[PDB]
Design a protein around this ligand. Structure first.
Ligand SMILES: [Zn+2]
Ligand SMILES: [Zn+2]
Lengths: 271, 279
C-alpha cells in the first residue's frame, strides 16, 4: 500500500492515480493524515476489502505522510560505513520542523549539513515491543532529511542535538508512506543523496548499527510508542562535516534525496 | 485564574471547588485541556463574563494541566549552582532537549524506579497560550497561558552514557514528567520571574531556590526557542532545576524504594510522590 498527503488530505495511491480516503470511505477515515494512524488496523482492513472508486489525477501540494506525530525519535551514529555505541543515541526533531517534500528550504546562518534517512512511521504502539515482531508495528516507511545546523548542534557543554535539527523545514518527509509489504527487503534498502547531481551519500540500510526492529524495541523499553510516531533512523557517511575540505549547503544548491523502492525528492536552498 | 485536569476533563478552579469547563461553556471550550490553549484568548474572555454553576468538589485523577503538548522543551543547566554541581561548564545559551509526551503525567501518588540512578529536579513549568516564531523577549510573558510545578526525573546512568550523550530518553521513563496539580495564570504571581521552588525527600530539604536565579529567564527561553522553532499554544517548557540534585552531592544520592519526594513552588502548588521498584 502507498499513501500520499495532497493538500492536507490523505490519499491512497492506486494505479497511476489517487483515491481520497475520506471521500471514498464516506468520512470513516481521514482526511487528516495523522488521524489515520489512530485508526490504522481498521483503515487497512477497509482499504484492502472495500470497493474503491476509480483513481483521480495526482495533483496538489505534497505534505508529510505523518505531519503531527506525538513523539519524534531521531537517531545519531547509527551507520557502519572502533567501538560502536552500546545503545542507540536518541534525540528529537521538533514537530514544527516537519514538512512535506517541499521545493525549497531556508538556509539559516551557520553550517547546514545533509543527512538522508529512512523514516519509519508507527502503525501500532506499546512498551516493550518485541524486536522479532517489530516490523508488524510499522505502518510504513518514507524518505527523510535530517537537516542539521552543525554549529548549534555541537556547541557548548554536553551538546544536545535537537534544536539545531529543528529549524523550519529541517524535517521533510515524503513523498509517500510505503507499507512494509512493498519493500523487497525492509532491512536492506539502498539510500543516498546528491548535491547538484553529485553523489554525497550512498549506502544501504543493512548497514544500520541498530536496525529498525532494534530501534523500535529499544525505544519502547523506555517510552510508550504511539501509532503515528516517527523515527528518523540515522544517516550513512558522506555528510559535509566529514568531507575534506568540509562542505556545507550553500544558496542555490539542489539536494536530491532517495531511497530505492520508497521514493525521492529534491529541494533547493535559499537564503 | 487556576485550571486543573480531572479525569482528563479541564476544570476551572472557583473558590474552594471546581467547575467543568465543557459543561459550563455548553461545549464551546474543552473538555480536552489542549483545546483551551489553542483558543486561549477566547476562553479567557468567556470565563471573564460567564455565569458558572456552583463549584463541585475536586474528585478524580489529577492529570497534567497540559497532557498532550505538541512540543516539550526541557532546559538543562539553567541555574548557576546546578551547572557547577553537574561537573559541566556553565552554558552560554540554553541547553535544550525534550521529555517525550508518553512520560507526562499529573502528580501521581507513585513512580516506578527503573534500574539505575534516579535523580530529582524541581522545575517551574511554563505552558504556552499563544504561539509563534521570533517572539520578542519583552513580550514573552504575554504568550504564556500559565505556570505549574514539575519534576524532571532523570535516570543518570542512561543520561550520561555512551558517545555524545543525549539527555531526553533518560528523562522520559514512565511517570518521569509529572506536572501539576494546577495551572496558575501569570496575573496571580506577584513577580512571575521570581518564584520560590524546592523539593524534600522524607521531609528533608534537598532543593530550595528562587526562579530569579534562572540563568536564562522564562522570557529569554521563549524568545530563544522561537528563533529556531515555531512554539504552539499548549506547548510545555521545563525551565530547568536549581542545585541540590542527587548526582551533585558527596556522596551521590539517588531515589530509593520507599522514598517520598515532595515538590513545591510557593504560592503555585505542591505534590508528593513515593518511589517503588519493580521487585
Ligand atoms: Zn540524523
Ligand atoms: Zn531538568
Amino acid at each position: 500500500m502507498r499513501l500520499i498527503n495532497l493538500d492536507g488530505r490523505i490519499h491512497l495511491v492506486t494505479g497511476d492515480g489517487v483515491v481520497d480516503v475520506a471521500k471514498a470511505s464516506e468520512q470513516r477515515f481521514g482526511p487528516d493524515p495523522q488521524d489515520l494512524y489512530q485508526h490504522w488496523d481498521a483503515f487497512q482492513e477497509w482499504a484492502r476489502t472495500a470497493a474503491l472508486p476509480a483513481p483521480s489525477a495526482r495533483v496538489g501540494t505534497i505534505g508529510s505522510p505523518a505531519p503531527l506525530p506525538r513523539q519524534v525519535f531521531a537517531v545519531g551514529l547509527n551507520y557502519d560505513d572502533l567501538s560502536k555505541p552500546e545503545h542507540p543515541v536518541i534525540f528529537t526533531k521538533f514537530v514544527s520542523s516537519i514538512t512535506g517534500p517541499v521545493e525549497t528550504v531556508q538556509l539559516p546562518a551557520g553550517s547546514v549539513d545533509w543527512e538522508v534517512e529512512l523514516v519509519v512511521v508507527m502503525g501500532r504502539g506499546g512498551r516493550n515491543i518485541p524486536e522479532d515482531r517489530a516490523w508488524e508495528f510499522v505502518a510504513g516507511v518514507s524518505v527523510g532529511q535530517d537537516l542539521s545546523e552543525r554549529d548549534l548542534q555541537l556547541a557548548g557543554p554536553a551538546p544536545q542535538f535537537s534544536l539545531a535539527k529543528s529549524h523550519a523545514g529541517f524535517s521533510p518527509i515524503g513523498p509517500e508512506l510505503v507499507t512494509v509489504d512493498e519493500l523487497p527487503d525492509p532491512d536492506d534498502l539502498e539510500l543516498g543523496a546528491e548535491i547538484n547531481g553529485e553523489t554525497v551519500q550512498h549506502s544501504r540500510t543493512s548497514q544500520l548499527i541498530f536496525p529498525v526492529s532494534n530501534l523500535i524495541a529499544y525505544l519502547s523499553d523506555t517510552v510508550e510508542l504511539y501509532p503515528g510516531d516517527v523515527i528518523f533512523t540515522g544517516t550513512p557517511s558522506g555528510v559535509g562535516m566529514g568531507r575534506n575540505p568540509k562542505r556545507f549547503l550553500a544558496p542555490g544548491d539542489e539536494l536530491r534525496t532517495y531511497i530505492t523502492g520508497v521514493g525521492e525528492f529534491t529541494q533547493r536552498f535559499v537564503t
